[PDB]
Amino acid sequence: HDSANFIKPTSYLAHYLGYAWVGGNHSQYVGEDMDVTRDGDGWVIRGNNDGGC
Amino acid sequence: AEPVYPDQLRLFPVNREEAQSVKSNIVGMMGQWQISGLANGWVIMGPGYNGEIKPGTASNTWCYPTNPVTGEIPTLSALDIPDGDEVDVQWRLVHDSANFIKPTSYLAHYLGYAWVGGNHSQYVGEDMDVTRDGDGWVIRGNNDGGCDGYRCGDKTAIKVSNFAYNLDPDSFKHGDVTQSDRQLVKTVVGWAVNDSDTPQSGYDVTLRYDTATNWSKTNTYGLSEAVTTKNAFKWPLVGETELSIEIAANQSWASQNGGSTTTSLSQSVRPTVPARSKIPVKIELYKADISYPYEFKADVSYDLTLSGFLRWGGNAWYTHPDNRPNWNHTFVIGPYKDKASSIRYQWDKRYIPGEVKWWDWNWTIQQNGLSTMQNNLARVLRPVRAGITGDFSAESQFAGNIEIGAPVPL
């Protein structure tokens, strides 16, 4: 849940390698508007998909 | 950045990540089509907007109070039970109304179980019957006379079993060990002769006895194909004859599983013999039944099982069923063993929506209040200490004997 130390660097790493749509619908920048969820024994971080794009 | 407990929230500071971390609880606590701000231009929308979090502005802001409090379950002092045997201690434990019967009945009531009480009172935990059943105990409301209500004859049942003891290291003692029904297995006698000028200790005699069992199972399948040709010919001297040719092929597959278990036991003697002397030895093995008494001081833990049907008007199960189903659940009152049976683990992890799989404690906090649930759970989980005396017995065990004799000069 650390945005400045964990969420931003990993999103930027994914962006630099060529992955698409690293971000949420409520911002224009990489690593913004990201949702964190608990799934099984791990965690999933993905951009918010509410509204339209 | 910091965990947020929903019971601490107040609609007067709340980050977007904090609001998203606890989303369903915040959405459930606001009216439909209500819009309130979070912080730094972000606002959260109520039901009908599907809980969307989008930039906006508002004067009504959610705000975690400047100094929130910790909601840990308090720890109480131990309860002392008069000394006796295991069953006496259990009987004294399960017949305490103020310390055992009331807290467990209130815990069952708070979770949504129906009819926790007897017919001769209007309050929870009153008019309860205690009975001895097998290796455990059953506590249920008295069902004499009549009652008025939908399925008022289906009283919730509380069951106690699987008692365990955590001994104090320096308190255990045991008495005389006695044997009965002794049957001989095998014996051996021998001599150790030393004719040198120095003491010698290089001698060894060993007796060992083993038993074992085994099992296996096998499955087999197969196929077969055959072609036959038959004709008739006339050959010199033999005359008419019949000639038949057959060719065949087959395939087969098999699979096997098995296992075994072996029991063994051995005895050895290694004497030291003085110079110019001899020593006799003897080893014996028996089967016998063993008995001895013991005593100690320990801490008592047990399993708690609740059985009944959940109320239609609301219950604490995380799916919130409304068809009045029959329910069973077991708690372990003591050291941690599993997540599904640990009250403390579920209570501590109530700020993570993905960990709520058995009981919804935030619902109970909303229904009854934080301090009421804290005190009830503190009374439920109170430690218990007592002194124990008992008896041990077992059939068909092993008994041995090893002897070194006196030296005889050569």
XYZ file of C-alpha atoms in Angstrom:
463
model
C 0.000 0.000 0.000
C 3.022 2.330 -0.291
C 2.390 4.461 -3.372
C 5.704 6.342 -3.529
C 7.956 3.377 -2.698
C 6.171 0.376 -4.255
C 3.254 1.292 -6.529
C 4.975 3.930 -8.674
C 8.285 2.108 -9.427
C 6.619 -1.162 -10.447
C 4.077 0.635 -12.648
C 6.887 2.574 -14.327
C 8.857 -0.648 -14.842
C 5.817 -2.249 -16.479
C 5.323 0.856 -18.637
C 8.947 0.980 -19.811
C 8.849 -2.653 -20.968
C 5.879 -2.037 -23.281
C 2.822 -3.064 -21.257
C -0.405 -1.245 -22.093
C -2.757 0.834 -19.928
C -0.828 0.977 -16.646
C -3.191 3.317 -14.836
C -6.741 4.092 -13.840
C -9.547 5.896 -15.640
C -9.473 8.968 -13.359
C -5.941 10.127 -14.237
C -3.701 10.654 -17.263
C -0.418 9.505 -15.668
C 1.237 6.126 -15.158
C 0.760 4.620 -11.704
C -2.235 6.752 -10.706
C -5.691 5.571 -9.605
C -4.557 2.027 -8.797
C -6.628 -0.510 -6.857
C -5.074 -2.956 -4.381
C -6.891 -6.183 -3.515
C -6.157 -9.307 -1.476
C -6.458 -12.519 -3.502
C -5.561 -15.870 -1.971
C -1.987 -15.845 -0.694
C -1.017 -12.874 -2.865
C -1.995 -9.338 -3.868
C -3.168 -7.791 -7.143
C -2.607 -4.171 -8.206
C -4.545 -2.865 -11.206
C -5.887 0.431 -12.481
C -9.430 1.395 -11.569
C -11.929 0.543 -14.316
C -14.944 2.606 -13.215
C -16.609 4.885 -15.724
C -15.511 5.034 -19.338
C -12.270 5.246 -21.271
C -0.245 3.945 4.521
C -1.945 3.105 7.825
C -4.628 0.475 8.501
C -8.114 1.889 9.056
C -10.677 0.155 11.259
C -14.239 0.899 10.076
C -15.546 1.248 13.641
C -13.254 4.285 14.059
C -14.590 6.190 11.033
C -16.462 9.455 11.531
C -18.162 11.748 9.001
C -17.042 15.130 10.329
C -7.379 13.146 6.547
C -8.636 10.118 4.578
C -6.415 9.214 1.638
C -7.731 7.789 -1.618
C -5.774 4.586 -0.980
C -7.215 4.406 2.542
C -10.758 4.831 1.209
C -10.187 2.156 -1.446
C -8.633 -0.259 1.070
C -11.890 -0.316 3.053
C -14.538 0.253 0.375
C -17.573 -1.969 0.986
C -17.787 -0.975 4.660
C -17.653 2.742 3.821
C -20.222 2.356 1.031
C -22.559 0.397 3.302
C -22.437 3.100 5.977
C -23.712 5.902 3.705
C -27.105 6.560 2.183
C -27.966 5.916 -1.437
C -26.927 8.724 -3.811
C -24.925 10.400 -1.030
C -21.694 12.173 -2.011
C -18.998 13.048 0.533
C -15.389 14.136 0.072
C -12.239 12.244 1.090
C -9.134 14.460 0.735
C -7.070 16.408 -1.848
C -9.901 16.815 -4.355
C -11.134 13.212 -4.150
C -14.708 12.308 -3.207
C -16.493 8.995 -2.670
C -20.003 8.285 -3.944
C -22.669 6.145 -2.314
C -24.796 3.251 -3.540
C -26.483 3.783 -6.873
C -23.157 5.202 -8.058
C -21.557 1.783 -7.380
C -19.201 3.342 -4.843
C -17.190 5.215 -7.466
C -14.264 7.333 -6.263
C -13.670 10.305 -8.560
C -12.263 13.835 -8.254
C -14.717 16.335 -6.846
C -15.513 18.701 -4.006
C -17.597 18.512 -0.840
C -17.899 20.099 2.594
C -18.900 16.856 4.368
C -15.682 14.861 4.714
C -14.955 11.464 6.182
C -12.203 11.822 8.761
C -10.345 9.305 10.900
C -10.192 10.993 14.360
C -6.843 12.594 15.184
C -6.030 9.989 17.871
C -7.845 6.685 17.272
C -7.755 3.868 19.808
C -6.622 0.251 19.676
C -9.390 -2.344 19.652
C -7.466 -5.341 20.965
C -9.252 -7.916 23.120
C -8.128 -7.438 26.747
C -6.485 -10.211 28.761
C -7.969 -11.115 32.150
C -6.434 -12.863 35.139
C -6.572 -16.648 35.325
C -9.473 -18.577 36.855
C -8.478 -21.122 39.510
C -10.359 -24.438 39.745
C -10.101 -26.667 42.913
C -7.796 -29.695 42.424
C -9.196 -33.118 41.394
C -9.228 -35.610 38.482
C -9.754 -34.562 34.826
C -13.556 -35.176 34.990
C -13.991 -33.324 38.320
C -12.229 -30.270 36.872
C -14.393 -30.395 33.740
C -17.551 -30.711 35.855
C -16.544 -27.721 37.980
C -15.751 -25.730 34.833
C -18.980 -26.386 32.917
C -21.244 -25.672 35.914
C -20.052 -22.088 36.527
C -22.926 -19.846 35.454
C -21.255 -16.443 35.857
C -17.875 -17.409 34.381
C -18.728 -19.996 31.698
C -22.450 -20.310 30.948
C -23.282 -16.617 30.502
C -20.338 -15.545 28.260
C -20.726 -18.447 25.822
C -24.499 -17.949 25.582
C -23.975 -14.241 24.906
C -21.352 -15.053 22.263
C -23.798 -17.419 20.559
C -26.532 -14.768 20.762
C -24.372 -12.001 19.277
C -23.471 -14.134 16.245
C -27.127 -14.671 15.296
C -28.058 -18.032 16.825
C -31.705 -18.455 17.795
C -33.340 -19.290 21.137
C -30.336 -19.236 23.479
C -32.261 -19.764 26.696
C -34.830 -21.798 28.557
C -38.613 -21.608 28.683
C -38.752 -20.302 32.278
C -36.959 -16.990 31.650
C -36.927 -14.101 29.178
C -33.154 -13.467 29.192
C -30.210 -14.967 27.321
C -28.269 -17.603 29.248
C -30.985 -18.359 31.811
C -32.603 -21.725 32.589
C -29.845 -23.774 30.947
C -29.424 -27.535 31.350
C -26.003 -29.196 31.599
C -25.613 -32.872 30.704
C -22.745 -35.342 30.352
C -22.597 -36.982 26.917
C -19.754 -39.317 26.001
C -16.407 -37.573 26.402
C -17.968 -34.105 26.263
C -20.696 -31.891 27.718
C -23.832 -30.315 26.244
C -25.445 -27.069 27.433
C -28.933 -26.234 26.168
C -31.971 -24.309 27.330
C -34.655 -26.177 29.236
C -37.539 -27.273 26.999
C -40.190 -28.128 29.607
C -43.642 -26.637 29.253
C -44.610 -24.495 26.294
C -43.148 -21.617 24.326
C -44.480 -18.938 21.980
C -42.519 -18.164 18.821
C -41.568 -19.433 15.383
C -39.676 -22.702 15.956
C -39.201 -21.883 19.637
C -38.684 -25.603 20.271
C -35.361 -25.586 18.386
C -33.005 -24.402 21.145
C -29.358 -23.609 20.222
C -26.928 -26.243 21.587
C -23.424 -25.523 23.007
C -20.945 -28.458 23.136
C -17.521 -28.711 24.925
C -14.914 -31.442 24.120
C -11.203 -32.206 23.340
C -9.660 -30.991 26.624
C -5.874 -30.371 26.536
C -3.333 -29.521 29.231
C -0.218 -27.321 29.222
C 1.897 -28.573 32.118
C 4.201 -26.566 34.337
C 7.654 -28.095 33.688
C 8.656 -28.644 37.334
C 5.356 -30.020 38.693
C 5.016 -33.491 37.129
C 5.357 -36.576 39.345
C 4.446 -40.249 39.047
C 4.239 -43.185 41.444
C 5.012 -46.890 41.374
C 4.905 -48.725 38.040
C 3.137 -52.087 38.292
C 2.867 -54.970 35.835
C 0.311 -57.711 35.256
C -0.373 -60.507 32.758
C 3.291 -61.094 31.930
C 4.223 -63.320 28.970
C 7.782 -64.358 28.115
C 9.326 -63.535 24.735
C 12.987 -64.572 24.826
C 15.979 -64.720 27.181
C 19.753 -65.094 26.836
C 22.602 -65.851 29.255
C 26.332 -65.694 28.681
C 29.829 -65.249 30.063
C 32.553 -62.657 29.455
C 36.052 -64.073 30.008
C 39.166 -61.891 30.339
C 42.490 -63.756 30.436
C 44.734 -60.748 29.744
C 46.706 -58.589 32.183
C 44.620 -55.418 31.727
C 40.936 -54.573 32.222
C 38.875 -55.136 29.084
C 35.592 -53.501 28.092
C 35.144 -54.811 24.533
C 32.119 -57.084 24.982
C 28.606 -56.915 23.535
C 25.487 -59.102 23.595
C 22.341 -57.859 21.839
C 18.768 -59.182 21.591
C 16.241 -57.680 19.162
C 12.572 -58.430 18.416
C 10.566 -57.136 15.429
C 6.961 -57.296 14.183
C 5.341 -55.893 11.041
C 2.198 -55.757 8.889
C 1.531 -54.864 5.247
C -1.221 -54.452 2.644
C -1.668 -53.863 -1.084
C -4.277 -53.459 -3.833
C -4.078 -53.950 -7.610
C -6.200 -53.171 -10.689
C -5.706 -54.762 -14.124
C -7.237 -54.271 -17.587
C -6.509 -55.873 -20.940
C -7.540 -56.574 -24.521
C -7.118 -59.479 -26.969
C -7.480 -60.029 -30.767
C -7.396 -63.377 -32.664
C -7.765 -64.547 -36.301
C -8.351 -68.176 -37.316
C -8.312 -69.898 -40.721
C -9.565 -73.437 -41.384
C -9.260 -75.598 -44.508
C -9.303 -79.239 -45.618
C -6.856 -81.136 -47.830
C -6.105 -84.701 -48.901
C -2.542 -85.832 -48.124
C -0.923 -89.217 -49.084
C -1.542 -91.970 -46.479
C -3.144 -89.433 -44.071
C -6.014 -89.062 -46.577
C -8.390 -86.179 -45.855
C -7.248 -83.878 -43.051
C -8.197 -80.539 -41.506
C -5.570 -77.815 -41.098
C -6.220 -74.791 -38.834
C -3.982 -71.713 -38.274
C -4.437 -69.191 -35.418
C -2.644 -65.900 -34.695
C -3.333 -63.797 -31.600
C -2.134 -60.698 -29.756
C -2.848 -59.216 -26.334
C -2.187 -56.108 -24.240
C -2.464 -55.430 -20.508
C -2.079 -52.593 -17.988
C -1.768 -52.733 -14.193
C -1.505 -50.384 -11.207
C -0.628 -51.090 -7.563
C -0.458 -49.332 -4.186
C 0.502 -50.477 -0.714
C 2.052 -49.741 2.651
C 3.477 -51.237 5.823
C 4.305 -50.528 9.484
C 7.109 -52.141 11.547
C 7.609 -52.287 15.365
C 11.018 -53.166 16.900
C 12.847 -53.280 20.284
C 16.400 -54.297 21.354
C 18.501 -54.745 24.552
C 22.304 -54.736 24.943
C 24.851 -55.295 27.721
C 28.517 -54.229 27.524
C 30.348 -55.111 30.748
C 33.830 -54.114 31.875
C 35.778 -57.124 33.171
C 38.848 -56.959 35.453
C 42.064 -58.734 34.529
C 42.118 -62.516 35.033
C 38.409 -62.862 35.793
C 34.993 -63.571 34.279
C 31.513 -62.042 34.555
C 28.034 -63.467 33.812
C 25.240 -61.543 32.091
C 21.527 -62.049 31.433
C 18.844 -60.306 29.338
C 15.074 -60.902 29.405
C 12.089 -59.548 27.456
C 8.402 -59.682 28.420
C 4.975 -58.450 27.365
C 2.809 -57.001 30.124
C 0.096 -54.472 30.975
C 1.455 -51.290 32.668
C -0.166 -48.991 35.296
C 0.990 -45.953 37.367
C -0.544 -42.786 38.898
C 0.537 -39.204 38.239
C -0.117 -35.578 39.156
C 0.706 -32.121 37.790
C -0.494 -28.541 37.330
C -1.506 -27.305 33.881
C -3.542 -24.817 31.855
C -6.798 -26.109 30.377
C -7.928 -25.572 26.781
C -10.883 -27.060 24.913
C -12.978 -26.945 21.744
C -16.248 -24.983 21.671
C -18.984 -25.936 19.194
C -22.195 -23.996 18.527
C -25.147 -25.710 16.840
C -28.420 -24.123 15.792
C -30.120 -22.099 13.088
C -29.385 -18.470 12.252
C -31.994 -15.752 12.693
C -33.822 -14.426 9.638
C -33.617 -10.817 10.836
C -29.813 -10.726 10.758
C -26.722 -12.761 11.595
C -22.946 -12.424 11.575
C -22.096 -14.938 8.842
C -20.278 -13.197 6.013
C -22.819 -14.194 3.336
C -25.758 -13.148 5.589
C -28.207 -15.949 4.704
C -31.916 -15.296 5.188
C -33.459 -18.784 4.857
C -32.788 -19.900 8.467
C -30.226 -22.651 7.775
C -28.822 -25.093 10.302
C -25.277 -24.158 11.260
C -22.306 -25.737 13.018
C -18.988 -24.078 13.850
C -16.090 -24.954 16.155
C -13.786 -22.562 18.011
C -10.523 -23.512 19.717
C -10.315 -21.798 23.119
C -6.551 -21.714 23.585
C -3.379 -21.696 21.494
C -3.653 -20.977 17.779
C -4.285 -23.976 15.525
C -6.119 -22.685 12.435
C -7.590 -19.508 10.954
C -11.186 -20.778 10.804
C -11.209 -21.586 14.536
C -9.271 -18.592 15.931
C -11.317 -15.705 17.324
C -8.291 -13.452 17.862
C -6.977 -13.827 14.303
C -10.355 -13.000 12.758
C -10.814 -10.070 15.144
C -7.386 -8.606 14.357
C -7.809 -8.970 10.574
C -11.173 -7.190 10.310
C -9.582 -4.254 8.447
C -8.818 -6.459 5.415
C -11.978 -7.265 3.378
C -10.264 -10.175 1.623
C -9.627 -12.014 4.901
C -13.291 -12.047 6.002
C -14.296 -15.624 5.210
C -16.138 -16.945 8.280
C -17.585 -14.270 10.577
C -18.230 -10.543 10.164
C -17.134 -8.894 13.414
C -17.697 -5.354 12.100
C -21.399 -6.225 11.895
C -21.353 -7.280 15.556
C -19.541 -4.066 16.524
C -22.177 -2.026 14.679
C -25.009 -3.971 16.321
C -23.777 -3.990 19.925
C -20.855 -1.590 20.283
C -17.100 -1.955 20.603
C -16.737 -2.205 24.387
C -19.554 -4.737 24.831
C -17.976 -7.130 22.328
C -14.507 -6.492 23.783
C -15.651 -7.399 27.306
C -17.655 -10.424 26.135
C -14.734 -11.831 24.136
C -12.335 -11.096 27.009
C -14.557 -13.085 29.374
C -14.888 -15.910 26.834
C -11.117 -16.292 26.351
C -10.146 -16.163 30.039
C -7.314 -18.555 31.006
C -8.028 -21.526 33.286
C -5.602 -23.250 35.678
C -6.072 -26.292 37.908
C -4.240 -29.156 39.583
C -4.695 -32.637 38.148
C -4.353 -36.197 39.434
C -4.916 -39.251 37.287
C -4.135 -42.849 36.399
C -2.319 -44.413 33.443
C -2.932 -47.872 31.999
C -2.094 -49.675 28.764
C -2.233 -53.249 27.472
C 0.474 -55.380 25.838
C 3.537 -53.194 26.363
C 7.199 -54.164 26.719
C 9.180 -54.932 29.875
C 12.900 -55.681 29.983
C 15.675 -56.607 32.391
C 19.467 -56.378 32.014
C 21.941 -57.625 34.624
C 25.716 -57.577 35.113
C 26.968 -60.144 37.618
C 29.837 -60.248 40.090
C 33.354 -61.132 38.890
C 34.902 -64.538 39.531
C 38.716 -64.802 39.759
C 40.405 -67.181 37.332
